[PDB]
Amino acid sequence: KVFGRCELAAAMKRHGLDNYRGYSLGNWVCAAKFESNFNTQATNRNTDGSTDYGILQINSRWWCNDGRTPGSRNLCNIPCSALLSSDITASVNCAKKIVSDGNGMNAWVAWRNRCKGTDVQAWIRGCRL
């Protein structure tokens, strides 16, 4: 499912990401835009053989099991496939664990490079929330 921008802002809010660990909703939308272009099915292989999955490109090195990332962890206790569902519940719950881990949203390289320090509130402009 490719979410619309406001559609995804609404779902993220519903699931409690608005100001989670202090990050306003626009941060999460911006991260999703540049991680996956709002496509829940997005996947991308990393150099180390790990893979990023879903709307927030959560990595199999630490967070989810895909059966093919040797020596990895599954800290969200989920198959990485669950991160590709049209329902974002699993992504959001796992993102909450990630963002709580110490480096906040810097965990997401695209957030750090493309969202951090920018006017992220623009990502939710015009949305009914």
Cβ–Cβ < 8 Å for 54, 84: yes
The C-alpha atoms of residue 35 and residue 66 are separated, in whole angstroms, by: 19
Among 27, 36, 51, 69, binds Na ion (CB under 5 A): 69
Q: Tell me the per-residue interface mask from 35 to 64 with Na ion, x by CB under 5 A, - otherwise.
A: -------------------------x----
Q: Is 118 in the site for Ru ion (CB under 5 A)?
A: no
101 is in an annotated binding site: yes
Q: 19: number of CA atoms within 13 Å, CB side?
A: 0
- The neighbour count for residue 17, using CB atoms within 10 Å, is 25
Q: Whole-number minimum distance, CB 69 to Cl ion, in Å? A: 4
Which entry of Na ion, Ru ion, Cl ion, none binds 57, CB below 5 to 8 A by partner kind? none
Burial class (CB in 10 A: 0-12, 13-18, 19+), 18: middle
The piece of 18-26, 51-59, 91-99, 116-124 that touches Ru ion (CB under 5 A) is: 116-124
52 in catalytic set = yes
Binding residues (CB under 5 A) for Na ion: these are: 60, 65, 69, 72, 74
